[model samples]
Target: QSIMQRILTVFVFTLLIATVGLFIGQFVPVALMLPLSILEVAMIILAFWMRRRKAVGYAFVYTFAFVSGITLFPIVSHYASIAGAYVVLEAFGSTFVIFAVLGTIGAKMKKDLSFLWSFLLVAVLALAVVGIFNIFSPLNSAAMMAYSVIGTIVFSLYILYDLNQIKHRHITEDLIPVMALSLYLDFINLFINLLRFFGILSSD
Candidate 1:
C-alpha cells in the first residue's frame, strides 16, 4: 500500500478504537480507572515490543488506543460539565484544522525533521516537570494558560515532525501501528491543550 493509504487505514482504526474507549469511559466505574490506566501503559510498552519483534502489533495498538480513550474520559467529562458540548466540538474542529495543515506541510517539505526529536524531547521533559509541579503546587490561571499555549505549540510541532517521518520513509510500513500511535498521541495532546486554552478563554 501507498504511504497515504497506510496512514488512512491507521486513522480509521484509531477512530474506531477511540470510540470504544470513549463509550467505556462514560459508563465504566471510577474503580476501574487505576487498573485501566495501568493496562493502558502496559499495552503501550507491549505495542513497542510487538513492533520490534515484527509480531502482531495492531492488536496492542487498538488496546492501547481504547484504554487511552477511557483514561481521557475524566478530562473530557470535566470540561463538558463546566463548558458544555460546544467547547468539545470547537476543540475537535481546531485540532482537525491544525493537524491537516501541519500534516500537509510535513508531507510536502524536502528538509529533514530529525532535529525535532531532541528539541521536542527537551520540551516534553520540561513540560512534564512543570505539569507535575502544578499538581503539587498549582500554578495560577495565567500561568496555566501560558503552559497550555506552550504545550499546544509543542505538540503541533510533533504532528508536523511525525507526519514528515512517515512521508520521508523514516517509518516503514511494517511499523504502521507505531507510527499511528505517534500521530495519535500528537493529535490528542494538541487537542487537550487547545481545549484547555479555549475553555479558559471562553470562560472569561
Candidate 2:
C-alpha cells in the first residue's frame, strides 16, 4: 500500500480501537482495572518483541485489546463511584503532547534514527528497573518527577525512531499494523507519564 493509504488505514484502525475502549469502559468493573492494565502492558510489550511482519498483526490485535481493557477501568470505576476520569483526560493530553513533541523532534533531528533503536531498548530496560524499584520503595516526589522526565524523553525518542521506520521502507507488508502499534505505544506512554505529572500536580 502507498504511504498515504497506510497512514489512513492506521488512523482508522486506531479509531476503532479507541471506540472499543470507550464502549468497554462503560461496562467493566473497577476492581479489575489493575489486572486489565497489566494485560494491556503485556500486549504492548509482546507487539514490540515480535518480528516486524508478525508484529504488525499483533500490534493491531493487542492495541484493540488494550484499549478495551483501559475502557473497562472507567466504567468499573464509575459503578464503584471512584470516578477515575483522570485516566481518560490524561490519554487525550498525552496524545496532544506526542504529536507536538514528534513534530519538533522530527523537524530538527539530523542523525539516522535507526541507530537509536538499541539505545532506546537500553533506556526502556533502565526505566523498567527504576519503575520496579519505585514500586517497592516510595521515592517521593523527586523520584516521580525523575521518572516522568525520563519517560517522556525516551518515549519521544521512540516516536522519532518509529516515524522513521514508517517513512523508511523497513517492512513492506502490514505497514498499517506497524504504524498503528507505534502510534499506540507512543500515545500510551505519553498518557502514563502525563498521569503521573497530574498526580503530582494535584497533590500540590
Candidate 3:
C-alpha cells in the first residue's frame, strides 16, 4: 500500500481503539487510572522501539492506541459530567473540522515546513512544563483557559507540520505507524484543548 493509504488505515484503527477506550473508561474503576497511564507510556515506548522492526510495529501501534484511549476516559468522563454531552459533541465536531482543514493545507502546500520542528519542539516542551506545574499548583479558570487556547494553537500547527512531512516523503512508509502516532497526538491534544476551552466558556 501507499504511504498515505497506510497512514490512513492506521489512523482509522487508532480511532477505533480510542472508541473502545472511551467505553471501557466509563466502566473501569478510578483506581485503574494510574496503572493504565503507565501502560499507555509503555505502549508508546514499545511502538517507538519497534518502529523499524517490521510487522511487530503494527501491534505496538494498536496497543498504544488502546491504552491511550483508556487513559482518556477520566478526562472525557469529567467533561461529560460537567458540561453535558453537547460540550463533548462540540469539541469532537470542531476537531474534525480543524483536522480536515489543516491536513489539506499540509498536503497541498508546496513549501517545506521542516523549519517548524525546532519551534514546535520548544513550544511543546514549554507546554509540558506548564501542564505539570498546573497539576500541582492548579491554575485559575482564566489561566486554564489561556493554557487551553495556547495548546490548541500549538497542536493544530503540529498537525500541519506532520502532514507536510508525510507529503514531502520525510517519513518513509515503514514508519507509517510513527507518523500516525504523531498525527494522533496532535489530533487528540487539539481535541482536548478545544473541549476544555469550550467547557470553560460554557461554565457559569
Per-residue lDDT tens digits for candidate 2, residues 1-204, read: 576356536655665676567666665555755542343244335435532445447555556645644554543343233325564575466767676678456635665567777788877777766665654575687777678778778776777777666665455664566666666656566555655555555545
- Candidate 1, residue 187: CA error in Å? 0.8
For model 3, state the Cα shift of residue 158 in Å. Answer: 0.6
What TM-score fits each model? 0.84, 0.71, 0.87
Write candidate 3's Cα lDDT for 1-204 as tens digits.
Answer: 778878977988899998897788677776666532233234323332333345436777788778778777777766667778788999999999989999989977999898887797777767766765665577788997898899889888888887888888655666877778767767777877888788878875
Clashes (backbone N, CA, C under 3 Å), per candidate, total 0, 2, 0
2 or 3, which is superior by TM-score? 3
Look at candidate 1 and tell me the lDDT of residue 183: 72
C-alpha lDDT of candidate 2 relative to the true structure? 0.58
Query: Each candidate: what lDDT?
Result: 0.72, 0.58, 0.74
Q: Give lDDT: candidate 2, residue 203.
A: 49
Highest TM-score scorer:
3
Candidate 2 segments whose C-alpha is farther than 4 A from its true place: 35-55, 58-91, 100-111
Q: Tell me the spans in candidate 1 whose CA falls farther than 4 Å from its real position.
A: 30-56
Give all candidate RMSDs, comma-separated: 4.0, 4.5, 3.8
Error of 1 at 184 (Å): 0.7
Worst 10 residues of 2 by lDDT: 74-83
